[PDB]
From Swiss-Prot:
May form homohexamers. Interacts with N protein. The gene is rep. Inhibited in vitro by GRL-0617. Residues 1-167 form the Macro domain. This is Papain-like protease nsp3. It comes from Severe acute respiratory syndrome coronavirus 2 (2019-nCoV). Responsible for the cleavages located at the N-terminus of the replicase polyprotein. Participates together with nsp4 in the assembly of virally-induced cytoplasmic double-membrane vesicles necessary for viral replication. Antagonizes innate immune induction of type I interferon by blocking the phosphorylation, dimerization and subsequent nuclear translocation of host IRF3. Also prevents host NF-kappa-B signaling. In addition, PL-PRO possesses a deubiquitinating/deISGylating activity and processes both 'Lys-48'- and 'Lys-63'-linked polyubiquitin chains from cellular substrates. It is a multi-pass membrane protein. It catalyses: Thiol-dependent hydrolysis of ester, thioester, amide, peptide and isopeptide bonds formed by the C-terminal Gly of ubiquitin (a 76-residue protein attached to proteins as an intracellular targeting signal). It comes from the Viruses. The chain holds residues 1025 to 1191 of 7096 of the full protein. It is found in: Host endoplasmic reticulum membrane.
Length: 167
């Protein structure tokens, strides 16, 4: 039993809700919140900009030190950093950005990072400003993640479309 509330169950391990991931993280304080990161951990917009703003820029400060030490992530890769006031940990995961021409096949590799964590609150990878089809992202999630994932979808219209079209 966990504290996630109001989710629709899609499969044995995948759950979905129309919610602002920032507000959901502040309420649940999950062990892991997933960020829709880029390789430079520059949290300017989309989910990343919203999560970072909610930390009063502490996420960005921590991320800049991470990059200065380690260099950029790989597309499809991830790193674990602090969750600040939102969660114990933040798993920064880089899905391919279609608006940069990145290989959509890397979306499966990106979701594989979730399997290193028993329970996660997450957005749909590569959705939103990353330019991929969210219906496809949900399919890859369900077919790749085996751990317990609670997906927050900000847009109500998109949420309804994802549920109604789910096979
Ligand atoms: C600092 C708090 C805050 C600031 C700006 C916007 C938001 C909304 S969260 C959100 N944004 C984008 N895509 C998503 N997919 C699931 N959730 C989301 C919150």
């Amino acid at each position: 039993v966990n504290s996630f509330s109001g989710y629709l169950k899609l499969t044995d391990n995948v759950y979905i809700k129309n919610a602002d991931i920032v507000e959901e993280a502040k309420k649940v304080k999950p062990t892991v919140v997933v960020n829709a990161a880029n390789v430079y951990l520059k949290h300017g917009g989309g989910v990343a900009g919203a999560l970072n703003k909610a930390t009063n820029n502490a996420m960005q400060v921590e991320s800049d030190d991470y990059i200065a030490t380690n260099g950029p992530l790989k597309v499809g890769g991830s790193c674990v950093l602090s969750g600040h006031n939102l969660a114990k940990h933040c798993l920064h995961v880089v899905g391919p950005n279609v608006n940069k021409g990145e290989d959509i096949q890397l979306l499966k590799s990106a979701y594989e990072n979730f399997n290193q964590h028993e329970v996660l609150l997450a957005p749909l990878l590569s959705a939103g400003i990353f330019g991929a089809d969210p219906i496809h992202s949900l399919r890859v999630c369900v077919d790749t993640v085996r751990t317990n994932v609670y997906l927050a979808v900000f847009d109500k219209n998109l949420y309804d479309k994802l549920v109604s079209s789910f096979l």
